[PDB]
Amino acid sequence: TTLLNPYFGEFGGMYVPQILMPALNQLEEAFVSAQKDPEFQAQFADLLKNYAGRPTALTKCQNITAGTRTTLYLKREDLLHGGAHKTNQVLGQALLAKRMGKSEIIAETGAGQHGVASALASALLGLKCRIYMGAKDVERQSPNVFRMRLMGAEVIPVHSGSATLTDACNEALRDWSGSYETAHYMLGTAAGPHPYPTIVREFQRMIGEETKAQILDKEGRLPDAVIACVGGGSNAIGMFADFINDTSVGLIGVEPGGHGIETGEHGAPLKHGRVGIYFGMKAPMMQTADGQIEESYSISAGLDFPSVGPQHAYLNSIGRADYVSITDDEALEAFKTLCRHEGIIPALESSHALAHALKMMREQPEKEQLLVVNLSGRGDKDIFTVHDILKARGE
Amino acid sequence: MERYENLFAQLNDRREGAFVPFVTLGDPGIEQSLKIIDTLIDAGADALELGVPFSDPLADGPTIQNANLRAFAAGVTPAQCFEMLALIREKHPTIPIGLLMYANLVFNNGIDAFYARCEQVGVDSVLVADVPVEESAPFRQAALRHNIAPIFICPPNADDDLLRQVASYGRGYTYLLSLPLHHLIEKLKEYHAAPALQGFGISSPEQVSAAVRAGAAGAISGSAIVKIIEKNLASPKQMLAELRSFVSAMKAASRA
Ligand SMILES: *Cc1c(COP(=O)(O)O)cnc(C)c1O
Ligand SMILES: [Cl-]
Ligand SMILES: [Cl-]
Ligand SMILES: [Cl-]
Ligand SMILES: [Cl-]
Ligand SMILES: [Cl-]
Ligand SMILES: [Cl-]
Ligand SMILES: [Cl-]
Ligand SMILES: [Cs+]
Ligand SMILES: [Cs+]
């Protein structure tokens, strides 16, 4: 049995080899215990406040909306230690590892953002961190590899299979299957097998909780909609969770449209994929006709995955949340717009969320609407990508 | 599943264990794979476990990962694998054929239709690598409706409830990855489980004889056959010779 429901409607589950089920059951029990433990909550609150810097600002952006009836706030997860919302939940999961008596963390990484978050939580809490990374990825990610190594993590090149993310994830889970007595697998989004979608949501829900309190203080009401980008689904579920029962509040998730949905080069499985079973979950995924998992694409590495967390699929299915897509070109324009008009350099991931809010405004400029964008991270990492694109097309 | 029942009854009459090799279908290409599989049976394999190449396997070790990737290099698709399976069955009427699948390839075009295709081509069992007993209901049910044995792994970390479930739900054989080994075997028998095949790192004759002494019904070699394929890619002839030698030796060890 489980203590909690592993499913969101038809989506989710625990589709792992039998050997991993005790590890998932152990983690579920420790999470359920922790959530009832005031000392755990106080330790987590302490790290979020005094180490990560919560609460994060809620910024009202006036220049962008001038001359329209849109009021736009940005929830500043870009200001969290580490430069993105990822820090929130890795701190929680590190505390869970310690609760289970573990001193070691396993993670895998492709572009390296979750690897850096895992390494920083591990460094602070004195945990021995090993991050599996496909050999092809190590070669292409020197900056992130260096950050992880500076923070004392062991970055382990994986050369088997295609020597990329899949192969690193396999090796990490193979490791975990043997070492789960002493090591915790630190999954980097609200996806994978139960209990991870549940844990990651609960360890990100302060995004939406703070946003609600801040918007009640500033505007004396709830937002008309909250808007978040969707890679695996963690920042969006963290923003949405505290508003799910506030039926008047729109929940808008923005998937990457890449070069355009019609090109097939995108990462929008929730609206343009097909339910499948992979990575421990039944969830929308981008699939070949014969059930191979397709390669996704986005200008933004953080969004570039062919699946999504199961709670998003469920919220979509019942009509509680709506999901849209934004192309590379739309995200780039939003990125330039925020830099010029607000002095904030946004992550290209977050730029997808801002692009959709800008469209809601520009399409209907006399519509009264109070919007919050989850600004999931800062975009220092993206300036070379942006420069290279702008230079290539001559602008 | 009846091919397993008949096999184990015959082995029991010969006081013999089963030896079951694993290979990836289409590794290193379709025609070499068919030749490999014929060689395994000719050399004494009692049954086969056959993998279908999958784009993103998250439950296979390096040796198998590499085989998976080779079969893609040959452009091997699930459709082609099922063409191969019908051929194999047409040549070998009694050899039990088991598949080792990832869930998405079973779920893709409907679970029922997957098992119906297995039945049409004459597959006997399916082990779905990433479906634990807890999630197994629709797979088990579709397997049984189409006369396919659902195979479950009994892990080393297994508790009594899990032993009872695997014993209740499985057919054909129980896949043992090995509480004390002979104890697991005794409990599985107490619970009327499908006969146990030990599959933990089986690479030498003495492990086959050990399995038989422990009272398992035989042994599965999850990766040793694949290693031979990998070592011998440049010489197909030598590849078949070494596979014949290995399987001969392993089967000899089962005759206990
Ligand atoms: C990782 C990341 C994302 C995407 O991950 P989610 O789990 O969908 O939140 C989005 N924005 C930034 C800045 C990220 O680093
Ligand atoms: Cl429950
Ligand atoms: Cl509490
Ligand atoms: Cl308190
Ligand atoms: Cl350490
Ligand atoms: Cl409150
Ligand atoms: Cl049985
Ligand atoms: Cl093996
Ligand atoms: Cs305005
Ligand atoms: Cs995605």
XYZ file of C-alpha atoms and ligand atoms in Angstrom:
675
model
C 0.000 0.000 0.000
C 0.933 3.680 0.165
C 0.048 6.296 2.769
C -0.911 8.864 0.103
C -2.683 8.622 -3.244
C 0.023 8.071 -5.959
C -2.328 9.286 -8.716
C -3.851 12.533 -9.901
C -6.842 11.099 -11.680
C -5.408 8.730 -14.331
C -1.918 10.333 -14.157
C 1.108 9.554 -11.974
C 1.784 6.216 -10.275
C 4.984 4.351 -9.337
C 6.233 2.783 -12.569
C 9.638 1.652 -11.290
C 11.333 -1.778 -11.118
C 10.254 -3.744 -8.042
C 13.708 -3.253 -6.430
C 13.032 0.505 -6.095
C 9.615 0.248 -4.417
C 11.029 0.042 -0.832
C 13.029 3.230 -1.455
C 9.886 5.053 -2.639
C 7.861 3.704 0.292
C 10.587 4.749 2.761
C 10.649 8.251 1.264
C 6.850 8.564 1.380
C 6.762 7.563 5.075
C 9.545 10.025 5.934
C 7.775 12.823 4.040
C 4.435 12.129 5.744
C 6.217 12.166 9.112
C 8.162 15.340 8.320
C 5.043 17.240 7.273
C 3.610 16.593 10.753
C 6.852 17.476 12.564
C 7.087 21.132 13.783
C 10.855 20.789 14.234
C 11.309 19.707 10.607
C 9.137 22.600 9.443
C 11.136 25.047 11.581
C 14.462 23.742 10.226
C 13.174 24.059 6.646
C 11.795 27.567 7.344
C 15.187 28.603 8.811
C 17.104 27.495 5.717
C 14.599 29.132 3.356
C 14.733 32.444 5.213
C 18.307 32.832 6.462
C 20.153 30.914 3.753
C 17.968 31.160 0.630
C 16.543 34.630 1.363
C 12.747 34.005 1.459
C 10.317 35.651 1.252
C 11.075 36.716 -2.303
C 9.867 40.133 -3.562
C 6.678 40.670 -5.524
C 7.530 43.417 -8.015
C 4.896 45.586 -9.716
C 6.061 46.332 -13.266
C 4.745 49.718 -14.456
C 6.738 50.506 -17.572
C 5.721 47.317 -19.373
C 1.988 47.780 -18.860
C 1.734 51.545 -19.388
C -1.363 52.531 -21.394
C -3.208 49.232 -20.802
C -5.610 47.972 -18.137
C -3.219 45.160 -17.171
C -1.535 45.289 -13.749
C 1.436 42.883 -13.767
C 3.398 41.593 -10.787
C 6.480 39.394 -10.967
C 7.135 36.871 -8.202
C 10.916 37.238 -7.829
C 12.239 33.664 -7.586
C 15.177 35.077 -9.610
C 16.285 36.657 -6.300
C 16.478 33.325 -4.406
C 19.945 32.035 -3.567
C 21.129 30.088 -6.607
C 19.199 32.326 -9.014
C 16.122 30.094 -9.477
C 13.275 28.469 -7.518
C 15.052 25.062 -7.666
C 16.831 25.932 -4.392
C 13.575 25.700 -2.392
C 12.901 22.037 -2.908
C 16.481 20.724 -2.898
C 16.799 22.173 0.622
C 13.660 20.283 1.690
C 14.770 17.027 0.081
C 18.228 17.349 1.697
C 16.518 17.702 5.079
C 14.418 14.596 4.226
C 17.625 12.670 3.421
C 19.006 13.616 6.845
C 15.689 12.596 8.474
C 16.088 9.096 6.985
C 19.626 8.905 8.386
C 21.347 9.434 5.037
C 24.553 11.375 4.425
C 24.756 10.970 0.634
C 22.830 12.537 -2.299
C 22.513 11.198 -5.855
C 21.385 13.454 -8.673
C 21.687 13.487 -12.429
C 21.963 16.483 -14.692
C 21.991 17.456 -18.358
C 22.552 21.217 -18.701
C 23.523 21.362 -15.022
C 20.961 23.643 -13.306
C 19.504 20.914 -11.074
C 23.048 19.612 -10.572
C 24.173 22.983 -9.195
C 21.086 23.230 -6.963
C 21.726 19.718 -5.614
C 25.407 20.490 -5.035
C 24.666 23.702 -3.150
C 22.127 22.099 -0.802
C 24.556 19.228 -0.198
C 27.472 21.593 0.544
C 25.473 23.572 3.109
C 24.171 20.483 4.873
C 27.422 18.496 4.816
C 26.111 15.742 2.504
C 28.283 13.796 0.058
C 26.839 14.561 -3.379
C 27.396 12.560 -6.560
C 25.905 13.840 -9.801
C 25.796 11.521 -12.804
C 26.260 13.324 -16.097
C 26.478 11.897 -19.592
C 30.014 12.272 -20.999
C 28.648 14.295 -23.940
C 27.031 16.694 -21.443
C 30.153 17.155 -19.290
C 32.051 18.262 -22.425
C 29.395 20.875 -23.263
C 28.766 22.187 -19.728
C 32.164 23.278 -18.362
C 30.718 26.250 -16.327
C 28.086 24.200 -14.495
C 30.461 21.247 -14.065
C 32.934 23.703 -12.487
C 30.282 25.182 -10.152
C 29.302 21.663 -9.010
C 32.949 20.696 -8.412
C 33.687 23.942 -6.542
C 30.788 23.018 -4.254
C 32.464 19.663 -3.536
C 30.155 17.421 -5.589
C 31.544 14.401 -7.439
C 30.551 14.754 -11.056
C 30.562 11.274 -12.626
C 30.831 11.067 -16.453
C 28.592 8.348 -17.937
C 29.859 6.802 -21.197
C 27.412 3.915 -21.642
C 24.438 4.097 -24.019
C 24.203 7.482 -25.757
C 26.279 9.160 -22.989
C 23.593 11.773 -22.335
C 20.809 12.488 -19.812
C 18.926 9.170 -20.175
C 22.163 7.265 -19.481
C 23.013 9.453 -16.481
C 19.521 9.016 -15.041
C 19.733 5.204 -15.487
C 23.096 5.048 -13.720
C 21.815 7.313 -10.911
C 18.802 5.057 -10.374
C 20.996 1.928 -10.632
C 23.177 3.498 -7.957
C 20.146 4.368 -5.826
C 18.686 0.875 -6.158
C 21.798 -0.477 -4.363
C 22.637 2.422 -2.040
C 19.208 3.698 -0.903
C 19.998 2.662 2.691
C 22.625 5.431 2.752
C 21.798 7.683 -0.231
C 18.828 9.790 -1.299
C 17.925 10.403 -4.945
C 17.228 14.115 -5.320
C 14.759 14.394 -8.231
C 14.758 17.842 -9.779
C 11.108 18.510 -10.735
C 7.446 17.726 -9.891
C 7.521 14.507 -11.943
C 8.757 10.934 -11.719
C 7.195 8.259 -9.481
C 5.199 8.931 -6.348
C 6.011 10.413 -3.953
C 8.158 12.940 -5.847
C 5.397 15.012 -7.616
C 3.753 15.426 -4.188
C 6.974 16.212 -2.284
C 8.216 18.712 -4.871
C 4.886 20.553 -4.902
C 4.829 20.801 -1.108
C 8.443 21.999 -1.013
C 7.676 24.686 -3.667
C 4.231 25.816 -2.433
C 5.711 28.828 -0.585
C 5.871 30.481 -4.051
C 2.067 30.648 -4.269
C 1.516 31.110 -0.531
C 3.715 34.204 -0.423
C 2.253 35.512 -3.703
C -1.267 35.264 -2.252
C -0.288 37.128 0.947
C 1.645 39.790 -0.996
C -1.156 40.394 -3.493
C -3.736 40.577 -0.695
C -1.556 43.196 1.024
C -0.869 45.259 -2.131
C -4.179 44.994 -4.040
C -6.683 43.740 -1.430
C -7.812 40.863 -3.635
C -6.679 37.707 -5.415
C -5.043 37.814 -8.903
C -7.175 37.204 -11.988
C -4.503 34.719 -13.099
C -1.099 33.364 -12.196
C 1.215 32.394 -15.041
C 4.174 30.010 -14.897
C 6.477 28.246 -17.353
C 6.357 24.412 -17.405
C 9.466 22.262 -17.898
C 8.792 19.412 -15.526
C 6.272 21.486 -13.563
C 7.859 22.470 -10.204
C 7.738 26.269 -10.281
C 4.273 26.228 -11.842
C 2.856 23.776 -9.303
C 4.548 25.757 -6.529
C 2.821 28.927 -7.745
C -0.525 27.204 -8.398
C -0.959 25.005 -5.340
C -2.219 27.613 -2.850
C -4.691 28.979 -5.429
C -6.226 25.665 -6.577
C -9.208 26.063 -4.226
C -9.573 29.752 -5.152
C -11.760 28.967 -8.153
C -11.765 32.591 -9.429
C -8.010 32.535 -9.961
C -6.815 31.459 -13.402
C -3.905 28.986 -13.456
C -1.936 29.271 -16.709
C 1.016 26.981 -17.477
C 3.236 27.852 -20.437
C 5.020 25.077 -22.306
C 7.857 25.823 -24.772
C 6.678 25.988 -28.365
C 10.273 25.920 -29.700
C 10.380 26.659 -33.438
C 6.589 26.298 -33.508
C 4.209 23.465 -32.614
C 3.651 22.680 -36.335
C 7.409 22.063 -36.793
C 7.381 19.282 -34.187
C 10.400 21.028 -32.611
C 8.912 21.971 -29.247
C 8.587 20.718 -25.681
C 4.805 20.939 -25.220
C 3.664 17.347 -24.399
C 0.725 18.350 -22.207
C -1.168 19.867 -25.169
C 0.670 18.286 -28.097
C 1.910 14.912 -26.849
C 0.146 11.670 -25.862
C -0.177 9.881 -22.525
C 2.627 7.355 -21.994
C 4.529 5.605 -19.220
C 8.108 6.633 -18.600
C 10.405 7.918 -15.856
C 8.231 6.277 -13.231
C 4.967 7.984 -14.188
C 1.965 7.853 -16.504
C 1.967 11.331 -18.014
C 1.776 13.198 -21.349
C 4.903 12.715 -23.376
C 6.143 13.412 -26.838
C 6.075 10.059 -28.616
C 6.752 8.450 -31.976
C 3.798 6.531 -33.417
C 5.367 3.284 -32.126
C 5.866 4.546 -28.579
C 9.499 5.628 -28.559
C 10.050 8.852 -26.624
C 10.632 11.787 -29.000
C 13.375 14.378 -28.627
C 12.000 17.747 -27.429
C 13.368 21.192 -28.266
C 13.409 24.671 -26.708
C 15.783 27.602 -26.876
C 15.647 27.202 -23.077
C 17.419 24.108 -21.685
C 15.351 24.279 -18.465
C 12.137 23.653 -20.436
C 13.547 21.187 -22.942
C 11.972 17.891 -21.919
C 9.458 15.598 -23.678
C 7.251 15.045 -20.584
C 5.562 16.916 -17.700
C 4.508 16.314 -14.091
C 1.273 14.334 -13.619
C -0.552 16.892 -11.484
C -0.441 19.361 -14.431
C -1.979 16.710 -16.736
C -4.739 16.214 -14.141
C -5.417 19.927 -13.581
C -5.675 20.299 -17.353
C -8.018 17.311 -17.751
C -10.564 18.700 -15.258
C -10.302 22.256 -16.654
C -8.872 23.781 -13.448
C -5.688 24.909 -15.205
C -5.096 25.986 -18.784
C -1.918 25.325 -20.735
C -0.573 27.311 -23.640
C 2.696 27.492 -25.544
C 5.178 30.273 -26.366
C 7.779 30.061 -29.146
C 11.507 30.735 -28.930
C 10.925 34.058 -30.753
C 8.168 35.136 -28.374
C 10.319 34.244 -25.354
C 13.271 36.222 -26.765
C 11.119 39.315 -27.224
C 9.856 39.079 -23.637
C 13.468 38.715 -22.433
C 14.477 41.912 -24.282
C 11.350 43.716 -23.060
C 12.011 42.997 -19.365
C 15.690 44.006 -19.614
C 14.923 47.332 -21.314
C 11.817 48.370 -19.445
C 12.293 46.964 -15.943
C 16.060 46.454 -15.525
C 15.565 42.716 -14.804
C 17.357 40.072 -16.868
C 14.978 37.046 -16.765
C 15.814 33.372 -17.343
C 14.779 32.262 -20.842
C 12.545 29.693 -19.049
C 10.750 32.491 -17.150
C 10.641 34.567 -20.352
C 8.075 32.104 -21.697
C 5.748 32.932 -18.799
C 6.303 36.667 -19.226
C 5.730 36.405 -23.008
C 2.298 34.875 -22.439
C 1.350 37.592 -19.921
C 2.493 40.241 -22.450
C 0.236 38.622 -25.048
C -2.756 38.592 -22.652
C -2.174 42.312 -22.223
C -1.445 43.305 -25.819
C -4.267 41.216 -27.343
C -6.905 42.879 -25.134
C -5.358 46.127 -23.846
C -8.578 47.521 -22.390
C -9.337 44.340 -20.414
C -8.951 44.918 -16.682
C -6.718 42.157 -15.388
C -4.450 41.583 -12.403
C -1.729 39.100 -13.378
C 1.198 37.493 -11.574
C 4.088 35.903 -13.481
C 6.269 33.383 -11.699
C 9.732 34.788 -12.546
C 11.377 31.450 -11.920
C 14.989 32.556 -12.408
C 17.543 35.143 -13.510
C 18.982 35.179 -17.034
C 22.711 35.881 -16.650
C 23.200 32.289 -17.856
C 21.315 33.140 -21.069
C 23.108 36.284 -22.298
C 25.419 34.355 -24.655
C 22.473 32.428 -26.132
C 20.567 35.680 -26.679
C 23.593 37.555 -28.106
C 24.339 34.693 -30.510
C 20.753 34.634 -31.788
C 20.423 38.421 -32.190
C 23.775 38.608 -33.969
C 22.927 35.706 -36.304
C 19.766 37.345 -37.652
C 21.645 40.639 -37.891
C 19.628 42.573 -35.288
C 2.254 -19.956 -20.527
C 1.586 -23.726 -21.173
C 4.991 -24.078 -22.846
C 6.582 -23.300 -19.469
C 4.439 -25.876 -17.659
C 5.416 -28.531 -20.173
C 9.065 -27.500 -20.075
C 9.344 -27.648 -16.284
C 7.501 -30.984 -16.158
C 9.948 -32.435 -18.709
C 12.984 -30.976 -16.908
C 11.648 -32.439 -13.628
C 11.455 -35.863 -15.332
C 15.130 -35.470 -16.323
C 16.004 -34.052 -12.866
C 17.401 -31.063 -14.756
C 17.417 -27.292 -14.314
C 16.412 -24.757 -16.985
C 19.020 -22.513 -18.599
C 17.570 -19.331 -20.123
C 19.682 -16.761 -22.010
C 18.697 -13.103 -22.540
C 19.439 -11.281 -25.814
C 18.217 -8.005 -27.354
C 16.199 -8.595 -30.532
C 17.942 -7.105 -33.571
C 21.354 -6.809 -31.859
C 23.633 -6.357 -33.762
C 21.192 -6.535 -36.677
C 18.085 -8.474 -37.647
C 19.740 -11.296 -39.584
C 22.618 -11.787 -37.140
C 20.120 -11.762 -34.268
C 18.038 -14.544 -35.833
C 21.223 -16.596 -36.266
C 22.259 -15.883 -32.649
C 18.865 -16.999 -31.353
C 18.918 -20.215 -33.384
C 22.429 -20.909 -32.035
C 21.275 -20.403 -28.436
C 18.490 -22.972 -28.875
C 20.629 -25.438 -30.818
C 23.314 -25.223 -28.087
C 20.825 -26.161 -25.368
C 18.875 -23.091 -24.208
C 15.630 -24.343 -22.634
C 13.752 -21.040 -23.103
C 14.554 -17.492 -24.256
C 14.191 -14.024 -22.772
C 14.162 -11.446 -25.557
C 14.359 -7.653 -25.265
C 12.643 -5.126 -27.525
C 14.833 -1.990 -28.111
C 13.430 1.105 -26.303
C 14.531 4.763 -26.730
C 15.019 5.594 -23.083
C 15.576 2.490 -20.888
C 15.936 3.420 -17.227
C 16.308 -0.110 -15.819
C 19.166 -1.760 -17.799
C 22.909 -1.997 -16.960
C 25.716 -0.786 -19.350
C 26.049 -4.050 -21.277
C 22.329 -4.020 -22.097
C 22.294 -0.239 -22.640
C 24.941 -0.747 -25.334
C 23.012 -3.627 -26.979
C 19.873 -1.460 -26.966
C 21.799 1.243 -28.863
C 23.285 -1.208 -31.404
C 19.789 -2.468 -32.283
C 18.768 1.121 -32.962
C 21.852 1.469 -35.223
C 20.294 -1.289 -37.317
C 17.013 0.702 -37.232
C 15.179 -2.055 -35.325
C 11.561 -1.187 -34.466
C 8.979 -2.987 -32.261
C 7.136 -3.962 -35.444
C 10.273 -5.619 -36.757
C 10.764 -7.391 -33.439
C 7.293 -8.939 -33.678
C 8.108 -10.099 -37.225
C 11.239 -11.759 -35.753
C 9.227 -13.339 -32.944
C 6.762 -14.990 -35.360
C 9.743 -16.433 -37.310
C 11.414 -17.730 -34.163
C 8.215 -19.441 -32.977
C 7.673 -20.958 -36.446
C 11.087 -22.661 -36.199
C 10.866 -23.718 -32.555
C 7.462 -25.093 -31.465
C 8.129 -25.873 -27.810
C 10.847 -23.439 -26.675
C 9.156 -20.949 -24.286
C 9.654 -17.363 -25.456
C 9.514 -14.553 -22.934
C 9.758 -10.835 -23.646
C 11.395 -8.193 -21.505
C 9.488 -4.962 -22.243
C 9.351 -1.389 -21.002
C 5.847 -0.243 -20.005
C 5.498 2.433 -22.665
C 5.942 -0.075 -25.513
C 3.161 -2.212 -23.990
C 0.889 0.737 -23.209
C 1.517 2.567 -26.513
C -1.266 1.292 -28.746
C -3.341 -0.191 -25.921
C -2.265 -2.826 -23.381
C -4.822 -5.376 -24.559
C -3.725 -5.093 -28.188
C -0.094 -5.579 -27.161
C -0.880 -8.890 -25.469
C -3.103 -9.932 -28.376
C -0.150 -9.398 -30.711
C 2.041 -11.437 -28.344
C -0.471 -14.267 -28.487
C -0.713 -14.066 -32.302
C 3.068 -14.458 -32.732
C 3.261 -17.184 -30.046
C 5.085 -15.401 -27.169
C 4.642 -17.254 -23.838
C 5.475 -14.635 -21.182
C 6.068 -10.916 -20.683
C 8.141 -9.293 -17.949
C 7.492 -5.539 -17.880
C 10.681 -4.067 -16.327
C 9.175 -0.862 -14.896
C 5.819 -2.204 -13.668
C 5.943 -3.309 -9.993
C 3.296 -5.715 -8.676
C 1.544 -2.663 -7.159
C 0.856 -1.241 -10.650
C 0.531 -4.569 -12.475
C -3.234 -5.174 -12.566
C -4.074 -4.120 -16.191
C -0.929 -5.822 -17.489
C -1.514 -9.124 -15.648
C -5.171 -9.155 -16.683
C -4.448 -8.540 -20.386
C -1.634 -11.114 -20.291
C -3.906 -13.813 -18.817
C -6.787 -13.073 -21.229
C -4.357 -13.745 -24.083
C -2.731 -16.880 -22.598
C 0.493 -14.994 -21.760
C 2.271 -15.532 -18.442
C 2.933 -12.258 -16.554
C 6.446 -12.564 -15.030
C 7.406 -10.758 -11.847
C 10.738 -10.080 -10.218
C 11.226 -11.218 -6.646
C 13.946 -8.854 -5.354
C 16.517 -9.508 -2.585
C 14.731 -6.785 -0.558
C 11.450 -8.838 -0.639
C 9.079 -9.022 2.376
C 6.330 -11.575 3.075
C 3.503 -9.530 1.549
C 5.551 -9.165 -1.631
C 6.332 -12.902 -1.714
C 2.579 -13.626 -1.402
C 1.757 -11.151 -4.181
C 4.376 -12.389 -6.622
C 3.324 -15.970 -5.840
C -0.341 -15.097 -6.448
C 0.045 -12.886 -9.546
C 2.888 -14.477 -11.546
C 2.732 -17.383 -13.984
C 5.288 -19.225 -16.093
C 8.236 -18.599 -13.769
C 9.207 -16.308 -10.904
C 12.257 -14.172 -11.723
C 14.409 -14.336 -8.592
C 17.086 -11.717 -7.988
C 19.134 -13.192 -5.107
C 16.769 -12.904 3.331
C 18.569 -16.265 2.646
C 18.329 -17.542 -0.942
C 17.097 -21.070 -0.189
C 14.537 -19.534 2.199
C 13.024 -17.346 -0.549
C 12.801 -20.451 -2.740
C 11.085 -22.408 0.067
C 8.584 -19.607 0.756
C 7.792 -19.195 -2.956
C 7.008 -22.934 -3.064
C 4.888 -22.693 0.113
C 2.875 -19.942 -1.629
C 2.456 -22.000 -4.847
C 4.459 -19.505 -6.922
C 5.518 -20.147 -10.511
C 8.845 -22.114 -10.523
C 11.822 -19.854 -9.652
C 14.614 -18.973 -12.086
C 17.584 -17.301 -10.442
C 18.712 -14.283 -12.479
C 21.288 -12.484 -10.306
C 24.533 -12.071 -12.285
C 24.573 -15.609 -13.751
C 27.721 -15.869 -15.835
C 29.449 -19.197 -15.042
C 28.563 -22.936 -14.858
C 29.047 -23.072 -11.082
C 26.278 -20.515 -10.583
C 23.876 -22.641 -12.614
C 24.698 -25.732 -10.512
C 24.387 -23.613 -7.364
C 20.892 -22.490 -8.446
C 19.771 -26.101 -8.974
C 21.158 -27.134 -5.561
C 19.216 -24.261 -3.965
C 16.128 -25.943 -5.457
C 15.447 -23.219 -8.054
C 14.010 -24.537 -11.322
C 16.936 -23.020 -13.244
C 18.916 -19.871 -14.025
C 18.682 -16.858 -16.360
C 21.782 -15.200 -17.778
C 20.704 -11.527 -17.953
C 23.845 -10.128 -19.651
C 26.640 -12.740 -20.197
C 25.331 -13.633 -23.683
C 25.199 -9.956 -24.658
C 28.811 -9.459 -23.517
C 29.841 -12.206 -25.978
C 28.028 -10.427 -28.801
C 29.772 -7.149 -27.928
C 33.269 -8.743 -27.786
C 32.836 -10.423 -31.166
C 31.190 -7.783 -33.379
C 33.939 -7.893 -36.012
C 33.630 -11.661 -36.458
C 30.059 -13.037 -36.802
C 31.446 -16.567 -37.227
C 33.507 -16.381 -34.018
C 30.503 -14.789 -32.296
C 28.296 -17.832 -33.007
C 31.066 -20.259 -32.005
C 31.651 -18.559 -28.633
C 27.907 -18.337 -27.938
C 27.538 -22.053 -28.714
C 30.426 -22.882 -26.371
C 29.081 -20.742 -23.539
C 25.496 -22.009 -23.737
C 26.663 -25.630 -24.006
C 28.709 -25.211 -20.809
C 25.892 -23.486 -18.926
C 23.299 -26.098 -19.909
C 25.709 -28.920 -18.929
C 25.833 -27.398 -15.413
C 22.039 -27.689 -15.116
C 22.079 -31.465 -15.604
C 22.551 -32.051 -11.926
C 14.586 24.405 -13.952
C 13.946 25.680 -14.253
C 12.655 25.746 -14.813
C 11.856 24.546 -15.248
O 11.649 23.558 -14.212
P 10.208 23.426 -13.584
O 10.381 22.165 -12.794
O 9.160 23.281 -14.706
O 9.943 24.639 -12.696
C 12.120 26.985 -15.034
N 12.749 28.141 -14.758
C 13.993 28.118 -14.290
C 14.689 29.410 -14.027
C 14.623 26.889 -14.012
O 15.878 26.931 -13.527
Cl -3.891 6.515 0.084
Cl 2.980 20.370 11.759
Cl 5.398 28.257 13.409
Cl 30.767 15.720 2.642
Cl -2.864 32.703 5.816
Cl 1.042 -18.897 -9.556
Cl 22.613 -10.209 -15.817
Cs -1.258 49.633 -16.370
Cs 8.264 20.253 -21.080
